[PDB]
Design a protein around this ligand. Structure first.
Ligand code: HEM
Ligand SMILES: CC1(C)[C@@H]2CC[C@@]1(C)C(=O)C2
Ligand SMILES: [C-]#N
Ligand SMILES: [K+]
Length: 405
């Protein structure tokens, strides 16, 4: 399904890339997107897939676009256009200066101060989940750890019942990697339908959970509205149930296939934090964008008001121009460059919580299960979208090679 080429788009810039089903997906999602960085591909191309839109292929352009919110607005951040138009989460769908006031409040429920407060619970849950799997000698990492670890921590922070995970998780997945049963707009409404009654309930009987803090919060000295609160909590649910969950699987998949890298972290534990950064670069997984506020000449390309442009956060770090031998994983990499957590005024506010969950996972898993690998004959399949992920990751190991402690 290719949309008719717009009149202002030259044919030499056409590259029909499908962000929801890249043709080289079987080789790994990151490898599939990297095709946009081959020698014969321009720095900015137009794809006729998913309604038609621009795609910045190099970190230089991606960073520049994210810094220039006057021309590249977050008002319509998702492709396809229907999704981007329906997208109204706060503060991701806002541009400065109005965005800032809301970002401050959001930082209050996911900022570093909140991570320090969860420090104990994060550490405890990781050890508990891993210790329970250790004696089994096998696991389906995606649903046995990757999901429950980050999600239970989020559900506790938001004061929501763990039994609501299945439903909420399904909805958020439809917003980033839709299966076709629900449009972005339908998933958003379902999400709001779930939150509306909860927000009102907590505005009446204020609690200490993230939702209560947002619902009874203030934005630059004035009371937040129920509508605004709803839009903020919606974003929280999505950011709490998708990114970290998927990134942990890309990292564990890599460790399972690389006995040498596991040994390195076992013999030199002080490199874990640095390894986390190298993995964040190599297995970057987000790709959203912006909409043009007006006609604008960008790097020799004529963009028209209303045009959508995908600015893959994932591609900056894979750009050979930013990191030599980009597909190569080296924990000793001197200057690790990437935009995995975004760039510009929307720079991820939960990155401190994400790094903590990643580092804790690396340490506590290798400490107990230093030896493991992909299940016999298993073929790990990835899925592409606004947030890419791993469909399943069956792992196996010899229980006698593990250490309970
Ligand atoms: C490894 C996982 C993570 C990655 C790769 C990631 C990535 C991103 C990126 C690329 C953006 C900016 C998107 C844009 O410019 O439109 C973003 C925004 C944001 N992230 Fe994360 N994130 C991660 C984890 C988290 C977690 C755990 C939380 C908190 C529960 C969180 C909360 C947020 C919030 C609130 C924003 C919006 C800030 C704003 O729009 O001003 N993120 N994230
Ligand atoms: C593209 C994103 C990672 C960013 C934070 C969560 C996400 C899925 C959004 O809807 C905005
Ligand atoms: C952030 N997700
Ligand atoms: K919108």
């Amino acid at each position: 399904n290719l949309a008719p080429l717009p009149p202002h788009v030259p044919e030499h810039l056409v590259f029909d890339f499908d962000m929801y089903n890249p043709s080289n997906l079987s080789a790994g999602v990151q490898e599939a997107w990297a095709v946009l960085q081959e020698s014969n591909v321009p720095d900015l191309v137009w794809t006729r897939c998913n309604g038609g839109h621009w795609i910045a292929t190099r970190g230089q352009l991606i960073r520049e676009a994210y810094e220039d919110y006057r021309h590249f607005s977050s008002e319509c951040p998702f492709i396809p256009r229907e999704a981007g138009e329906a997208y109204d989460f706060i503060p991701t769908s806002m541009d400065p200066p109005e965005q800032r006031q809301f970002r401050a409040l959001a930082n209050q429920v996911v900022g570093m101060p909140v991570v320090d407060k969860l420090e104990n619970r994060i550490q405890e849950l990781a050890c508990s989940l891993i210790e329970s799997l250790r004696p089994q000698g096998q696991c389906n990492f995606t649903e046995d750890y990757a999901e429950p670890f980050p999600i239970r921590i989020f559900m506790l922070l938001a004061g929501l019942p763990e039994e609501d995970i299945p439903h909420l998780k399904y909805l958020t997945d439809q917003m980033t990697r839709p299966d076709g049963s629900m449009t972005f707009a339908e998933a958003k409404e379902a999400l709001y339908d779930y939150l509306i009654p909860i927000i009102e309930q907590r505005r009446q009987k204020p609690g200490t959970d993230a939702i209560s803090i947002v619902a009874n919060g203030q934005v630059n000295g004035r009371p937040i509205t129920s509508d605004e609160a709803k839009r903020m909590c919606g974003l929280l649910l999505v950011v709490g149930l998708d990114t970290v969950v998927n990134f942990l699987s890309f990292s564990m998949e890599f460790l399972a296939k690389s006995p040498e890298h596991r040994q390195e972290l076992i013999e030199r534990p002080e490199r874990i934090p640095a390894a986390c950064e190298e993995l964040l670069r190599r297995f970057s997984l987000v790709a959203d964008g912006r909409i043009l506020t007006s006609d604008y000449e960008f790097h020799g390309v004529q963009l028209k008001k209303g045009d959508q442009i995908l600015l893959p956060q994932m591609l900056s770090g894979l750009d050979e121009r930013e990191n030599a031998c980009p597909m190569h994983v080296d924990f000793s990499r001197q200057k690790v460059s990437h935009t995995t957590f975004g760039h510009g005024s929307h720079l991820c506010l939960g990155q401190h919580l994400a790094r903590r969950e990643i580092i804790v996972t690396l340490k506590e898993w290798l400490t107990r299960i230093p030896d493991f690998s992909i299940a016999p004959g298993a073929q790990i399949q990835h899925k592409s979208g606004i947030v890419s992920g791993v469909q399943a990751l069956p792992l196996v190991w010899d229980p006698a090679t593990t250490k309970a402690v």
